[PDB]
Structure 1
Amino acid sequence: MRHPLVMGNWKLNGSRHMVHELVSNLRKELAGVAGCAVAIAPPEMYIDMAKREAEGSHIMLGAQNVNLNLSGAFTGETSAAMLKDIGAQYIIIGHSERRTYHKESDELIAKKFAVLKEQGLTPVLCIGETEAENEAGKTEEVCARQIDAVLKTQGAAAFEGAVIAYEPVWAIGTGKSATPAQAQAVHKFIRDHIAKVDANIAEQVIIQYGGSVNASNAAELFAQPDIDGALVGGASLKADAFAVIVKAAEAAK
């Protein structure tokens, strides 16, 4: 019942040159797809130009973060109002890397949520466990923790039209790997958590896999009922690769 979404996070990578090369390439590779929803999240500076570049395709636009103010004296902050204005739709928050580089709290993240919701943007919420928590067997403790930041204080409805991304931080950059069984298992947990509160809203959340996805796994990945897609990293930088993650989703779900 849930249409797949594949989002490619460029992180801190881009130029105009690249903006051009890659949007052009994505367009071409991506021709024919239909069964999959596709968004990209460049650096802030490049969103506008990227929109131009993508014009005439189905590639949607997103962003890697926001701050809490809509306008005002907040030098250097990022406004959701301005993201709306820019044409960005899908806003990454709580990306593991900000939680860690930037020390963003659940509360903070949860505030970030409220706001996007308020403007009518789509928040991609990023959650998941450290190497230690994982090892300690604390997946669900954490996950739920990370979700209740919203649910508790905003309600199940906050989740309507929302997206969740599971980052297995512990698999990432650690010579650890997650299987498909593992993720689907965490995915169910996530869905089920929200279901204990609001089942209908639960059915309709997009739970993307935020771990490492490649061609040897995309398909076995998208075959899990609770995995609605992927929040793609480094591969969102190579058109061809990207597009295969994509057609696997289309093919699969």
Structure 2
Amino acid sequence: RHPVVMGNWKLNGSKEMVVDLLNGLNAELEGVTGVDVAVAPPALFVDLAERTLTEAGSAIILGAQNTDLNNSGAFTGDMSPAMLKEFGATHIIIGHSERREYHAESDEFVAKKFAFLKENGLTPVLCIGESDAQNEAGETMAVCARQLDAVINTQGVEALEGAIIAYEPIWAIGTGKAATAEDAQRIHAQIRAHIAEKSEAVAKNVVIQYGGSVKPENAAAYFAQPDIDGALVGGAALDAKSFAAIAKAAAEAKA
């Protein structure tokens, strides 16, 4: 599996910040080819991001932070996969914990977004993860299996083909406290085993990303594990030198 490193900018961005970060990031990756680097800016800057990446002939992939379930029609304020496709955006984060929490997005709603993305030819980056209590109560795989099963049971294991899964221990997001690479590897192998119970072909090829607090200081340790195929980066994504460092560790690690 070819590693994939994705930067989720979250609610960060300004006209000047977008072009400087994308311009610099691209300079830093100037010979780096063993990783897929994607970037997800706020909806307001998807246009400026396409313009910049195009002008530079960048290979950096463009994504988005969320989607809704319609392409057009009377749905004020909604995100449309067809409109995203006009900007070349392909990797769409869905199910992030911040949305699952702040917007109360259920597994059923998230799985519906997974199917619509697939229907539209886009690549869903399905986020799954346990909370502090579930973790402590030892229900990690129970939660994970449950969230994956929302798409597997309604759509079939083959739906995961061409999808990216980002495992994020909720308590590791933004907190500075990252899971250890050994525990992360342990959860990824089980997430993989779960899918393999239904299909070995799908399981062997699905890119499972790690999403705790990946930083340049702990990246290589993660990319060293066999079942960790990349990272969904938040805070370190906002620094071209940091994100480029993380991307390189993945490229060297998986060659």
Match of 2:83 in 1: 82
Distance in 2, matches of 1:79 and 1:123, equals 14
The amino acid that maps onto 1:11 is: K
With normalisation by structure 2, the TM-score equals 0.97
Match of 1:239 in 2: 240
* CA apart distance, 1:233: 0.3
Distance in 1, matches of 2:200 and 2:169, equals 25
Match of 1:42 in 2: 41
Match of 2:209 in 1: 208
Secondary structure of the 2:243 match is helix
Match of 1:144 in 2: 145
1:11-22 correspondence to structure 2 within 5 Å: 11-22=10-21
Secondary structure of the 1:125 match is strand
Match of 2:52 in 1: 53
* 2:197 is the alignment partner of 1:196: yes
Secondary structure of the 1:170 match is helix
Given the superposition, is the C-alpha separation of residues 173 and 41 from structure 1 closer, same or farther in structure 2, using an over 3 Å criterion?
Answer: closer
Contact kept in structure 2, 1:156 and 1:197, CA below 8 Å: yes
Distance in 1, matches of 2:218 and 2:247, equals 12
Contact kept in structure 1, 2:181 and 2:222, CA below 8 Å: yes
* 2:229 is the alignment partner of 1:228: yes
Distance in 2, matches of 1:92 and 1:176, equals 22
Contact kept in structure 2, 1:134 and 1:170, CA below 8 Å: no
Distance in 2, matches of 1:200 and 1:175, equals 35
Distance in 2, matches of 1:114 and 1:173, equals 29
The amino acid that maps onto 1:32 is: G
* CA apart distance, 1:79: 0.8
Distance in 1, matches of 2:8 and 2:157, equals 27
Contact kept in structure 1, 2:173 and 2:211, CA below 8 Å: no
The amino acid that maps onto 1:240 is: K
The amino acid that maps onto 1:15 is: S
Q: Percent identity?
A: 65
Distance in 2, matches of 1:173 and 1:6, equals 17
Contact kept in structure 2, 1:164 and 1:206, CA below 8 Å: yes
Distance in 2, matches of 1:53 and 1:165, equals 27
* CA apart distance, 1:57: 1.2
* CA apart distance, 1:174: 5.2
Secondary structure of the 2:171 match is coil
Distance in 1, matches of 2:169 and 2:133, equals 11
1:16-58 deviation line (CA, Å, top 9, x unaligned): 1111111111111111100010000001111111011112111
The amino acid that maps onto 1:12 is: L
Provide the aligned length of Structure 1 versus Structure 2: 252
The amino acid that maps onto 1:80 is: P
Distance in 2, matches of 1:202 and 1:252, equals 20
* CA apart distance, 1:218: 0.7
Match of 2:22 in 1: 23
Match of 2:166 in 1: 165
Distance in 2, matches of 1:206 and 1:158, equals 13
Contact kept in structure 2, 1:124 and 1:164, CA below 8 Å: yes
The amino acid that maps onto 2:10 is: K
Given the superposition, is the C-alpha separation of residues 238 and 176 from structure 1 closer, same or farther in structure 2, using an over 3 Å criterion?
Answer: closer
1:111-165 deviation line (CA, Å, top 9, x unaligned): 0000000011000000000010001000000000000000000001111101000
* CA apart distance, 1:93: 0.3
* 2:141 is the alignment partner of 1:156: no
Contact kept in structure 2, 1:132 and 1:170, CA below 8 Å: no
Secondary structure of the 1:216 match is coil
Distance in 1, matches of 2:145 and 2:122, equals 23
